[PDB]
Design an enzyme around this catalytic site. Sequence first.
Site, PDB file in Angstrom:
ATOM      1  N   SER A  60       0.874   9.930 -10.048  1.00 17.52           N
ATOM      2  CA  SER A  60       0.284   8.831 -10.828  1.00 17.52           C
ATOM      3  C   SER A  60       0.497   7.415 -10.380  1.00 17.52           C
ATOM      4  O   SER A  60       0.104   6.477 -11.068  1.00 17.52           O
ATOM      5  CB  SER A  60       0.662   8.938 -12.294  1.00 17.52           C
ATOM      6  OG  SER A  60      -0.197   9.884 -12.901  1.00 17.52           O
ATOM      7  N   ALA A 119       1.013  25.237 -18.328  1.00 16.08           N
ATOM      8  CA  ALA A 119       1.865  25.821 -19.363  1.00 16.08           C
ATOM      9  C   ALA A 119       2.922  26.626 -18.626  1.00 16.08           C
ATOM     10  O   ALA A 119       4.075  26.686 -19.044  1.00 16.08           O
ATOM     11  CB  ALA A 119       1.033  26.739 -20.274  1.00 16.08           C
ATOM     12  N   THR A 121       4.479  26.799 -14.846  1.00 16.52           N
ATOM     13  CA  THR A 121       4.491  26.002 -13.624  1.00 16.52           C
ATOM     14  C   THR A 121       3.877  26.601 -12.364  1.00 16.52           C
ATOM     15  O   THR A 121       2.894  26.054 -11.835  1.00 16.52           O
ATOM     16  CB  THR A 121       5.915  25.526 -13.323  1.00 16.52           C
ATOM     17  OG1 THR A 121       6.385  24.772 -14.449  1.00 16.52           O
ATOM     18  CG2 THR A 121       5.943  24.638 -12.074  1.00 16.52           C
ATOM     19  N   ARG A 283       3.560   0.885 -15.305  1.00 16.25           N
ATOM     20  CA  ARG A 283       4.712   1.176 -16.156  1.00 16.25           C
ATOM     21  C   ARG A 283       5.788   0.114 -16.037  1.00 16.25           C
ATOM     22  O   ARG A 283       5.986  -0.473 -14.958  1.00 16.25           O
ATOM     23  CB  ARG A 283       5.353   2.541 -15.795  1.00 16.25           C
ATOM     24  CG  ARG A 283       4.509   3.792 -16.153  1.00 16.25           C
ATOM     25  CD  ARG A 283       5.315   5.105 -15.996  1.00 16.25           C
ATOM     26  NE  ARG A 283       4.540   6.299 -16.372  1.00 16.25           N
ATOM     27  CZ  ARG A 283       4.227   6.636 -17.624  1.00 16.25           C
ATOM     28  NH1 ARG A 283       4.620   5.877 -18.647  1.00 16.25           N
ATOM     29  NH2 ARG A 283       3.509   7.732 -17.860  1.00 16.25           N
ATOM     30  N   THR A 297       5.769   5.978 -11.820  1.00 17.27           N
ATOM     31  CA  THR A 297       6.428   7.203 -11.375  1.00 17.27           C
ATOM     32  C   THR A 297       5.292   8.135 -10.980  1.00 17.27           C
ATOM     33  O   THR A 297       4.132   7.948 -11.375  1.00 17.27           O
ATOM     34  CB  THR A 297       7.175   7.917 -12.516  1.00 17.27           C
ATOM     35  OG1 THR A 297       6.395   7.810 -13.715  1.00 17.27           O
ATOM     36  CG2 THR A 297       8.536   7.274 -12.773  1.00 17.27           C
ATOM     37  N   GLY A 298       5.622   9.142 -10.189  1.00 19.24           N
ATOM     38  CA  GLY A 298       4.606  10.087  -9.813  1.00 19.24           C
ATOM     39  C   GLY A 298       5.211  11.470  -9.784  1.00 19.24           C
ATOM     40  O   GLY A 298       6.377  11.661  -9.387  1.00 19.24           O
ATOM     41  N   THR A 299       4.436  12.430 -10.259  1.00 16.56           N
ATOM     42  CA  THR A 299       4.834  13.832 -10.217  1.00 16.56           C
ATOM     43  C   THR A 299       3.615  14.655  -9.782  1.00 16.56           C
ATOM     44  O   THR A 299       2.567  14.645 -10.444  1.00 16.56           O
ATOM     45  CB  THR A 299       5.289  14.388 -11.594  1.00 16.56           C
ATOM     46  OG1 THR A 299       6.489  13.743 -11.990  1.00 16.56           O
ATOM     47  CG2 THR A 299       5.564  15.894 -11.513  1.00 16.56           C
ATOM     48  N   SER A 324       9.683  19.342  -7.512  1.00 17.00           N
ATOM     49  CA  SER A 324       9.228  18.888  -8.832  1.00 17.00           C
ATOM     50  C   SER A 324       9.648  19.995  -9.813  1.00 17.00           C
ATOM     51  O   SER A 324      10.278  20.981  -9.415  1.00 17.00           O
ATOM     52  CB  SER A 324       7.719  18.629  -8.878  1.00 17.00           C
ATOM     53  OG  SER A 324       6.978  19.819  -8.703  1.00 17.00           O
ATOM     54  N   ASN A 325       9.298  19.836 -11.084  1.00 17.77           N
ATOM     55  CA  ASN A 325       9.697  20.768 -12.135  1.00 17.77           C
ATOM     56  C   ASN A 325      11.200  21.002 -12.080  1.00 17.77           C
ATOM     57  O   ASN A 325      11.665  22.136 -12.161  1.00 17.77           O
ATOM     58  CB  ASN A 325       8.946  22.123 -12.058  1.00 17.77           C
ATOM     59  CG  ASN A 325       9.159  22.956 -13.326  1.00 17.77           C
ATOM     60  OD1 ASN A 325       9.115  22.418 -14.436  1.00 17.77           O
ATOM     61  ND2 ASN A 325       9.398  24.248 -13.171  1.00 17.77           N
TER      62      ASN A 325
HETATM   63  C1  LIG Z   1       4.718  11.464 -14.239  1.00 19.80           C
HETATM   64  C2  LIG Z   1       3.445  10.690 -13.907  1.00 19.80           C
HETATM   65  N1  LIG Z   1       2.294  11.618 -13.944  1.00 19.80           N
HETATM   66  C3  LIG Z   1       1.728  12.067 -12.748  1.00 19.80           C
HETATM   67  O1  LIG Z   1       2.131  11.723 -11.665  1.00 19.80           O
HETATM   68  C4  LIG Z   1       0.579  13.032 -12.931  1.00 19.80           C
HETATM   69  C5  LIG Z   1      -0.460  12.892 -11.820  1.00 19.80           C
HETATM   70  N2  LIG Z   1       1.112  14.376 -12.918  1.00 19.80           N
HETATM   71  C6  LIG Z   1       1.237  15.131 -14.074  1.00 19.80           C
HETATM   72  O2  LIG Z   1       0.699  14.856 -15.125  1.00 19.80           O
HETATM   73  C7  LIG Z   1       2.157  16.333 -13.897  1.00 19.80           C
HETATM   74  C8  LIG Z   1       1.373  17.625 -13.621  1.00 19.80           C
HETATM   75  C9  LIG Z   1       2.297  18.861 -13.790  1.00 19.80           C
HETATM   76  C10 LIG Z   1       3.400  18.860 -12.708  1.00 19.80           C
HETATM   77  C11 LIG Z   1       4.392  20.080 -12.785  1.00 19.80           C
HETATM   78  N3  LIG Z   1       4.910  20.393 -14.122  1.00 19.80           N
HETATM   79  C12 LIG Z   1       4.662  21.693 -14.625  1.00 19.80           C
HETATM   80  O3  LIG Z   1       4.049  22.557 -14.031  1.00 19.80           O
HETATM   81  C13 LIG Z   1       5.247  21.938 -15.992  1.00 19.80           C
HETATM   82  N4  LIG Z   1       4.969  23.313 -16.434  1.00 19.80           N
HETATM   83  C14 LIG Z   1       5.540  19.770 -11.784  1.00 19.80           C
HETATM   84  O4  LIG Z   1       6.671  19.387 -12.258  1.00 19.80           O
HETATM   85  O5  LIG Z   1       5.252  19.899 -10.564  1.00 19.80           O
HETATM   86  C15 LIG Z   1       3.282   9.549 -14.905  1.00 19.80           C
HETATM   87  O6  LIG Z   1       2.632   9.774 -15.946  1.00 19.80           O
HETATM   88  O7  LIG Z   1       3.839   8.458 -14.606  1.00 19.80           O
END
Ligand SMILES: C[C@@H](NC(=O)[C@@H](C)NC(=O)CCCC[C@H](NC(=O)C[NH3+])C(=O)[O-])C(=O)O
EC number: 3.4.16.4
Length: 345
Positions: A60, A119, A121, A283, A297-299, A324-325
């Site tokens: 993100s 739901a 991972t 943010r 942050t990015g995930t 991640s996770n």
């Molecule tokens: C945090 C950041 N959001 C992001 O970067 C967006 C693009 N990513 C997500 O919404 C996480 C997707 C699931 C990841 C997965 N989690 C699962 O699979 C959980 N069951 C993982 O951790 O790879 C923000 O909002 O700042």
Amino acid sequence: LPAPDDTGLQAVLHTALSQGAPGAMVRVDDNGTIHQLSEGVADRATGRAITTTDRFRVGSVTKSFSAVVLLQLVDEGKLDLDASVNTYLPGLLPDDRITVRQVMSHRSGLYDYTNDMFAQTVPGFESVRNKVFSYQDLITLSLKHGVTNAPGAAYSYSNTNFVVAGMLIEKLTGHSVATEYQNRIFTPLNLTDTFYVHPDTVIPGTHANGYLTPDEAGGALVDSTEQTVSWAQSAGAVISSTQDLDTFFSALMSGQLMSAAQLAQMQQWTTVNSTQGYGLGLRRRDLSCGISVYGHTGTVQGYYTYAFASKDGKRSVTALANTSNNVNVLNTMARTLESAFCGKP
Ligand SMILES: C[C@@H](NC(=O)[C@@H](C)NC(=O)CCCC[C@H](NC(=O)C[NH3+])C(=O)[O-])C(=O)O
């Protein structure tokens, strides 16, 4: 600002490895003086070491790029933040009063379709990794659920919001988001390690591989490096480097990416929690030493990113752990901000 604390940064990285991150690294650009540290491996099977120049999926942080494009369109008079989304994208949402500003600040009430996708991972990842979605496909997934609250009600994170953001960008400009990011940000700032290649699964150049931690404690890690990221697109498919994200956030905060007026709108904070706010694709994090930093942050599967800069953009920090996770690693990596901005206790 106090001096960045490299010994503290070293410890943060070391702790992240002890918690499951194959590799972790951070780069600080402190008003012209660079700090750079890394520990661990970019590829855990071959054992190639991770370095601060390895490219990675920023998640993100992409939202900030999308918001920059949209705010430039506002400066150009092509978009009004308080106009309804349906004005620019007829019939898209069931509520013709949800506005662009609400979508950009997560106050739209739109259901987040990724809660359904992930739901579980690993199964969730295997399900979408090689899928190509249109922006509309994603919005439809969201709309199958009712909205979660009234527009403008309160902040509720939803990837759907920045999928809408991408759709707005392409409709109003008649170009792809890739083209807009390139022309408006990548080229002007000379971000040579930054790309948006959706739906390509390859990461250009030397990069850190991503390792997805399964939901089962102690479970084997899954190489999640190559995927389309089509489930995120304008909400999270950008690829970059620590140097490039530092340049980007410093340029954003130092006022080089839009008018002073639009940067002000971008920084109108909506409460996320007691120490965090959300503006427009941006943010705010409040550190223990009373300093606030800005960025995102990015995930993405296998990659946790923190990229934040000081209010004036003079100091920027980007940290990355290639797993991640794993909440332990996520929480630990947040400490890079404390060591880099707050310094030694
Ligand atoms: C945090 C950041 N959001 C992001 O970067 C967006 C693009 N990513 C997500 O919404 C996480 C997707 C699931 C990841 C997965 N989690 C699962 O699979 C959980 N069951 C993982 O951790 O790879 C923000 O909002 O700042």
